[PDB]
Design a binder for these strands. Structure first.
Ligand SMILES: Nc1ncnc2c1ncn2[C@H]1C[C@H](O)[C@@H](COP(=O)(O)OP(=O)(O)OP(=O)(O)O)O1
Ligand SMILES: [Ca+2]
Ligand SMILES: [Ca+2]
Ligand SMILES: [Ca+2]
Ligand SMILES: [Ca+2]
Ligand SMILES: [Ca+2]
Ligand SMILES: [Ca+2]
Ligand SMILES: [Ca+2]
Length: 901
DNA sequence: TCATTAAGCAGTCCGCG
DNA sequence: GCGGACTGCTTAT
């Protein structure tokens, strides 16, 4: 096989590399890598190295990396550009792996671990590590085994061995329901003292040294705790054995309002799964406890135990250990679904970076671009210092608040990366500037043509047309990869809808799910077989289809994220190719493009309907437009349609055969106007929305910018078995909104869009009557909790104290003295509830850590003093009044003349 | 929450005769 | 009460 790196580090004048050799063996080497950097040199000197602007460079070969680093400094002292890759390990990887890396994940040791620490006096601080580690579960991807290190003897209690037999039993038998598919994969090791446990763990670690190290909060808790505990017990040199190169560093993580300390293990790639989840999942969750995320992702039930976690080991050690094993497994189950490890390896090896650098699009793109240029013997510029400056973004149209019955939306494919490619926007393709007219003048095609030579953006920037810049070239490659995975995702989605239809008529038989690739549209034969399957098989197939769709979603949306972040990096001062001219050239071009096509679509439709000045485009945001289709439907007349699917077909056909060609013509004209390199403005029909045929549903509504709801029948070629609510920005979509209120508001919207005013009034009336029964957690608001200290004045709200912070302070007084009650953690999330006048807490609200039950001694008081009236008005009625006043509907029946009888 | 602009709403503080 | 100046937080893109 072709070799690939596993990890790479720089330690002084040495590169330390762990790699897979041509035989599949993991190896490690120390290499005295001699880096090269570059300086400009006279034109009259023969060279093969040129900077990105075509200026000649001389290569400087250094005896060692420290010499290269010192040279960079002296070049700053002289005031001359020191060119080339200054991150020497990236240069090492580029020299060592000078081909497209083909990796084999089955050779990469992925470790997933979790530790338990019994602590009576509150949260066990990883920097102190004053309490024994009493359980470690460490899953190894190469062995496919869960290694369980169990401490039987502690200052906090001596316990019996964990029993695998009881762990396997159902909870109804007194067991722990450890999933049977992992029972045989458990290797259990009990220890009668902590020192031998940790010593054996380190020997184990040495034998099976993680390459990828993951788990849940392992970077902030598990790793620093293990490291510091071993340090406290044995000394530093022993703790450093967690690094295969025996080097570690306490790294300070600086945010906006303070800092925390992580341990950097040289030669390990730490990908904390919480951090992967936050970056790649595209969710915002009310809580990030493993129980909460597990329930959300896998629909598995919460890990149930009596009493505090600090008493679980002594009271029920059996369950203590089993829950530790399950926690590690749940992360593996999340990854099996979401596939973020796979994604990280894909991206990491593509860019030729340390795998942990996938969190940084700036680092990722710096390495892609460097490797690309190096192939042509071109030399990257030195990174420079820049002040942070604001710059303009996307255009968002102000919509008229209203109901909108029939809506068809159109959308530009991967807009900003398409703009980069169309205009040819790159650091080295800048050709000059032109005198800019007001944007309006370009939108309306009255401004002078910017250039007859160069490719232009309406911000005044001109670009070369003779050859692609490195940014357009490299963005296209990832764009094309994305397209492939998006294809699989959509096929899987369309396949899901076929199964859902079939499920309406399941066959009474015993059979099996079909062995099929869900990434490809089902053949006619597969469709025929599906129509004969039982519910059991169909549901299994549905689960598999939806799993395939999720996998495709991960692959496509995060490739989209990486390419959009290249645009974003152009506006980040730390990016090597930071340039606000280029960042603004993209956004301004986008502003023109959207408003240009709004004008074109209006003109086209006014033409077909024989009108003038009618506004068909009701809304747009960045890259997409929403067109009122009422007049199109009215032109054939509703009574002419057989069913809903009939007008959806008609609108689908009108969009594809009439509107898309007109939209294309508009954009091709715009391309010529800006003299762009290549026409890449591809705007296709996105959504078809409207009420069910012959219903009183309103179909859709806008309340404002970034706030709307549509009843969608077809989305990007997926024809849904059941209409799907597309709701953007409204309270149903916000993590801050109580769970039960999201649900209620969503049902209110469903009724508005599908059934109409009367149905909405029925539901509202019932919700208002019953809501006081809802579980307190489900009706709690959620908020992140920053700067608690800032607003804490002697335990009371200081000036300008936010409502949620006030709640936390109330909570802190209620639990005062109690080290055992959960503390609210700065920067994490809290549930928030209002409190009625004259309550014992002495304030108008209380807040406690999210994803948790509030502590028992104050729970009964919270439940007794909860202000349901304020809760209802703030979270439910206020937003609903916003939806209904926009839609010109009443959520409560107005009095009529019929009330006389 | 270490990690690539537009614009909405909640809430504080305070003016608005 | 609302709405502007402002902080805080959270979405859409
Ligand atoms: N997370 C982000 N970071 C930077 N720019 C973004 C981000 N999300 C969106 N944008 C910008 C760049 C996008 O091209 C543009 C419109 O985004 P969006 O509507 O999500 O889809 P898209 O047009 O980029 O891709 P698609 O092909 O899926 O439509 O807005
Ligand atoms: Ca735990
Ligand atoms: Ca788009
Ligand atoms: Ca699209
Ligand atoms: Ca059937
Ligand atoms: Ca869009
Ligand atoms: Ca098209
Ligand atoms: Ca009480």
């Amino acid at each position: 096989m072709k070799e690939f790196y596993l990890t790479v580090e720089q330690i002084g004048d040495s590169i330390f590399e762990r790699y897979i050799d041509s035989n599949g063996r993991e190896r490690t080497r120390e290499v005295e890598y001699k880096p090269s950097l570059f300086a400009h040199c006279p034109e009259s000197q023969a060279t093969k190295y040129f900077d990105i602007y075509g200026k000649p460079c001389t290569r400087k070969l250094f005896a060692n990396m420290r010499d290269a680093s010192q040279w960079i400094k002296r070049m700053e002292d002289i005031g001359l550009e020191a060119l080339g890759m200054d991150d020497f390990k990236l240069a090492y990887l580029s020299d060592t792996y000078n081909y497209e890396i083909k990796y084999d994940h089955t050779k990469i040791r992925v470790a997933n671990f979790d530790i338990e620490v019994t602590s009576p006096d509150g949260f066990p601080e990883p920097s102190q590590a004053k309490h024994p580690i009493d359980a470690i579960t460490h899953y190894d991807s190469i062995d496919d085994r869960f290694y369980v290190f169990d401490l039987l003897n502690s200052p906090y209690g001596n316990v019996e061995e964990w029993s695998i037999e009881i762990a396997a039993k159902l909870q109804e038998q007194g067991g722990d329901e450890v999933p049977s598919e992992i029972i045989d994969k458990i290797i259990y090791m009990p220890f009668d003292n902590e020192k031998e446990l940790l010593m054996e763990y380190l020997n184990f670690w040495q034998q099976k040294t993680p390459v990828i190290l993951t788990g849940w909060n392992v970077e902030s808790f598990a790793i620093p705790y293990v490291y510091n505990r071993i340090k406290n017990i044995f000394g530093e040199s022993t703790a450093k054995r967690l690094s295969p190169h025996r080097k570690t560093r306490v790294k300070v993580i600086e945010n906006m309002y303070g800092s925390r300390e992580i341990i950097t293990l040289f030669g390990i790639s730490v990908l904390d799964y919480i951090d992967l989840y936050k970056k790649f999942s595209f969710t915002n969750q009310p809580s990030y406890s493993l129980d909460y995320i597990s329930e959300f992702e896998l629909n598995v039930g919460k890990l149930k135990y009596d009493g505090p976690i600090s008493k679980l080991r002594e009271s029920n050690h059996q369950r203590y250990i089993s829950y530790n094993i399950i926690a590690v497994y749940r992360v593996l189950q999340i990854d099996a679904k979401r596939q973020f490890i796979n994604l990280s390896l894909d991206m990491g090896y593509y860019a030729k970076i340390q795998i942990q650098s996938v969190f940084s699009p700036i680092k990722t793109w710096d390495a892609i671009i460097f490797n690309s240029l190096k192939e042509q013997n071109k030399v990257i510029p030195q990174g420079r210092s820049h002040p942070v400056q604001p710059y303009p973004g996307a255009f968002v149209k102000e919509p008229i608040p209203n109901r909108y019955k029939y809506v068809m939306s159109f959308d530009l494919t991967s807009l900003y990366p398409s703009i980069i490619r169309q205009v040819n926007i790159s650091p080295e393709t800048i050709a000059g500037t032109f005198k800019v007219a007001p944007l309006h003048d370009y939108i309306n095609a009255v401004a002078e043509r910017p250039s007859d030579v160069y490719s232009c953006s309406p911000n005044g920037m001109m670009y070369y047309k003779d050859r692609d810049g490195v940014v357009p070239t490299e963005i296209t490659k990832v764009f094309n990869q994305r397209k492939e995975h998006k294809g699989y995702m959509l096929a899987a989605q369309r396949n899901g809808e076929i199964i859902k239809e079939a499920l309406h008529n399941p066959n009474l038989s015993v059979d099996e799910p079909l062995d099929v690739d869900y990434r490809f549209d089902f053949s006619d034969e597969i469709k025929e077989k599906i129509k004969k399957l039982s519910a059991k098989s169909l549901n299994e197939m549905l689960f598999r289809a939806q799993r395939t769709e999720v996998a495709g979603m991960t692959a496509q949306i995060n490739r989209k994220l990486l390419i959009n972040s290249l645009y974003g990096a152009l506006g980040n001062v730390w990016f090597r190719y930071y340039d606000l001219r280029n960042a603004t050239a993209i956004t301004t071009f986008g502003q023109m493009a959207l408003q240009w096509i709004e004008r074109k679509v209006n003109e086209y439709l006014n033409e077909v309907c024989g009108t003038e000045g009618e506004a068909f485009v009701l809304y747009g945001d960045t890259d997409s437009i929403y067109v009122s289709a009422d007049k199109i439907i009215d032109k054939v007349g509703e009574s002419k349609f057989r069913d809903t699917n009939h007008w959806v077909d008609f609108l689908d056909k009108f969009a594809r055969e009439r509107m898309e060609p007109a939209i294309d013509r508009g954009f091709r004209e715009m391309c010529e106007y800006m003299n762009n390199k290549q026409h890449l403005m591809f705007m296709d029909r996105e959504a078809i929305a409207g009420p069910p045929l012959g219903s009183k549903g309103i179909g859709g509504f806008w309340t404002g910018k970034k706030r709307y709801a549509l009843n969608v029948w077809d989305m990007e070629g997926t024809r849904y078995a059941e209409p799907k609510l597309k709701i953007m920005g409204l309270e149903t979509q916000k993590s801050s909104t109580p769970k039960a209120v999201q649900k209620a508001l969503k049902e209110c919207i469903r009724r508005m869009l599908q059934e109409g005013e009367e149905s909405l009034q029925e539901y509202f009336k019932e919700f208002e009557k019953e809501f006081r029964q809802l579980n307190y957690i489900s009706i709690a608001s959620v908020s992140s909790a920053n700067n608690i200290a800032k607003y804490d004045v002697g335990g009371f709200p200081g000036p300008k104290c936010p409502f949620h912070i006030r709640g936390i302070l109330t909570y802190n007084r209620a639990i005062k003295g109690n080290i055992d009650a959960p503390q609210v953690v700065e920067g994490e999330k809290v549930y928030v509830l209002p409190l009625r006048e004259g309550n014992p807490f002495g304030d108008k609200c209380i807040a406690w850590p999210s994803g948790t039950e509030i502590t028992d001694l104050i729970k009964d008081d919270v439940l007794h003093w909860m202000d349901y009236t304020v809760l209802l008005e703030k979270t439910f009625i206020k937003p609903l009044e916003g939806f209904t006043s926009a839609a010109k509907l009443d959520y409560e029946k107005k009095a009529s003349l019929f009330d006389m009888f």
